[PDB]
Curated annotation (Swiss-Prot):
Highest taxon, organism lineage: Eukaryota
Protein species of origin: Homo sapiens (Human)
Purpose of the protein: Pore-forming subunit of the mechanosensitive non-specific cation Piezo channel required for rapidly adapting mechanically activated (MA) currents and has a key role in sensing touch and tactile pain. Piezo channels are homotrimeric three-blade propeller-shaped structures that utilize a cap-motion and plug-and-latch mechanism to gate their ion-conducting pathways. Generates currents characterized by a linear current-voltage relationship that are sensitive to ruthenium red and gadolinium. Conductance to monovalent alkali ions is highest for K(+), intermediate for Na(+) and lowest for Li(+).
Tissue: Expressed in numerous tissues. In normal brain, expressed exclusively in neurons, not in astrocytes. In Alzheimer disease brains, expressed in about half of the activated astrocytes located around classical senile plaques. In Parkinson disease substantia nigra, not detected in melanin-containing neurons nor in activated astrocytes. Expressed in erythrocytes (at protein level). Expressed in myoblasts (at protein level).
UniProt feature coiled coil, ranges: 30-59
Assembly and oligomerization: Homotrimer; the homotrimer forms a propeller-shaped Piezo channel with a cation-ion conducting pore. Heterotrimeric interaction may occur between PIEZO1 and PIEZO2. Interacts with PKD2. Interacts with STOML3. Interacts with TMC1, TMC2, PCDH15 and CIB2; the interaction may be part of the MET complex. Interacts with MDFIC (via C-terminus); the interaction prolongs Piezo channel inactivation. Interacts with MDFI (via C-terminus); the interaction prolongs Piezo channel inactivation.
Note: Piezo comes from the Greek 'piesi' meaning pressure.
Protein name: Piezo-type mechanosensitive ion channel component 1
């Protein structure tokens, strides 16, 4: 067990690397989700506006 625990500290920096990588991956996943959501909002917003313009021109006609 001396061996096991001596090298647990030797591979603790690798543990930190693994941790940070996983956390960053999850954070980027959430960022992607939020990016998609904002883009969806923009797509929808444009449909709403385009209609309110087909109806605006319809009023003119």
């Amino acid at each position: 067990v001396r061996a096991d625990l001596q090298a647990t500290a030797l591979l603790a920096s690798r543990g930190f690397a693994l941790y940070n990588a996983a956390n960053l991956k999850s954070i980027d996943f959430h960022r992607r989700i939020e990016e998609k959501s904002l883009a969806q909002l923009k797509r929808q917003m444009e449909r709403i506006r385009a209609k309110q313009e087909k109806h605006r021109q319809g009023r003119v006609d």
